[PDB]
Amino acid sequence: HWGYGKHNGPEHWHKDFPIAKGERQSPVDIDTHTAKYDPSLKPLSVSYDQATSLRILNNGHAFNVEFDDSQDKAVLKGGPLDGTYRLIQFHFHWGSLDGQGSEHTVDKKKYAAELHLVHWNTKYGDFGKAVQQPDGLAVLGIFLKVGSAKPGLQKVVDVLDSIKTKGKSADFTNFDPRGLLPESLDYWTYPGSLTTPPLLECVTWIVLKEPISVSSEQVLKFRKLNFNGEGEPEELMVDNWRPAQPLKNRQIKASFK
Template identity: 55%
Template sequence: MAQSVWGYDKENGPEHWHQNYPMAKGDKQSPIEINSKDVRHDTSLSPWHASYDPGAAKTILNNGRTCRVVFDDTFDRSVLRGGPLTGAYRLRQLHLHWGSADDHGSEHVIDGVKYAAELHLVHWNPKHGNFAGALKQPDGVAVVGVFLKVGKTPKPEMKRILEEIDNIKTKGKEAPFQHFDPSILFPKSRDYWTYHGSFTTPPCEECITWILLREPIEVSPDQMARLRSLSKNGENEPMCPLVDNWRPLQPVKGRIVRASFK
């Protein structure tokens, strides 16, 4: 298995990742299942807040593994603060993980419940100089996770991203994606769980403070179908639906999950 060809298929999927990326077998891996009975309500956890500059949005792309929106992170223009974090973390990109059907697709699982998709907003700590430096530090990265559930009243929030899907149908396609404020993707409630974990994709660096939002946002079956219409193959290859790009649950290994709510 070549360094660059990890994926989600039988031959290169999550159970093989550790062969090239030994960190994938580490003690602080993500995602995990969150069990309410094991969660510690922590009154010292403050509310988090995001101030995002819509002008920072740059492009949307299909890299064959996910749909990603990239932001300008050369200075503190879109930042996340508060919650379990110290200092301001810069927004770098957001991407999604989803299933082949509406009953699975999220990476984190809450009391046995899987959602149709999970949105990750990836931020890094500029005190470490650059993104590569942040990946080497335990407090280097903060990811806000938002669950997507399928319902009858789709939220307009996802519309903008999904409108662009037709322009990035195949692997390697990129399209301009300007003037977008990702904070519209947040649910009304700011309640969250937090724990220390890793990227859910190789090399699976253990540098992430996770902020998982308790309340999901709603998408329509139609909107989910659009995500599943992306191809993980290039333009001149057969259409191969990009689905089930989620990593299975990892062992908690004694980590404590804290909640901002009772």
């Protein structure tokens, strides 16, 4: 039911998901001047060398690249995190034009897109239990700006023609998500939520400071996807981002001095 349009988008979600107006909603604007270095953060560990990708799915809202999370392969640890968080999927949010598309903003600046690598805390056994816990999930967020092509993204771009419409999927084995990272792991972190319904307040957000560059041609192919199913009137999959939400009683901490 929910979506991104005038009649079912972010301003309507609260009617079926009242937590939309909650105390730790995401995304937020990251005021870089107010964010404070936190010496209590431990080194961040992104351990993706044994990742096992499986499938890419157009879910009608974005596309998800899904991973085998049946044991610790790709995991995120350290930083603000207590315990091991297993990678389950990644997806993006993007705009109709380069000047918008990110969910988080940096001193109010919107990036062209934002990558979310989604992980669940293994002490809760399964994703469904994890989303009943305040520390159930960790999402690693990475901004995309338009410039040079990102070679590690091209395999994703080139399969999108095969999943144009809602409900289509394709095999997507042997994809290495390490090729989507920037050089630096400097980050900001804060407690928040899922950015789509059901908007559950379970997420430790870790948002990298350094964007990745992707080419205009790469993001233009994201914008050829469809929200609609096969045979239905074409609705381009663009502007699938939620705007920044009130920070409320939170502080954004920085990993860097």
